[model samples]
Target: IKPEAPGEDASPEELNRYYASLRHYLNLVTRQRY
Candidate 1:
């Protein structure tokens, strides 16, 4: 399942998770680029 984005007031941990998720998603898109 896709991760949910952290809110503006989110905790550092949540932000970290979101950032990691974003990176994962970007990686996927890059891999899929044709």
Candidate 2:
């Protein structure tokens, strides 16, 4: 899967937060699948 690279106009904090949330949700799905 391809991830979107951070854009110049985007905030670093916001991008990191979004990535963290994404990781959290992916972990949840993996746990459920297992």
lDDT of each: 0.73, 0.62
> Where's the lowest-lDDT run of ten residues in candidate 1?
1-10
Poorest stretch of ten by lDDT in candidate 2 = 1-10
Across 1-34, the per-residue lDDT of candidate 1 in tens digits comes to 5555775545858677687778988888789588
Residue 4's lDDT within candidate 2 is: 50
Each candidate: RMSD: 4.7, 3.5
Q: Which candidate is the best by TM-score?
A: 1
Shift in Å, residue 31, candidate 2: 2.3
Q: For residues 1-34, what per-residue lDDT tens digits would candidate 2 score against the true structure?
A: 5245354334857577567656876787689695
Winner by lDDT:
1
- Pairing residues by index, what is the TM-score of model 1? 0.54
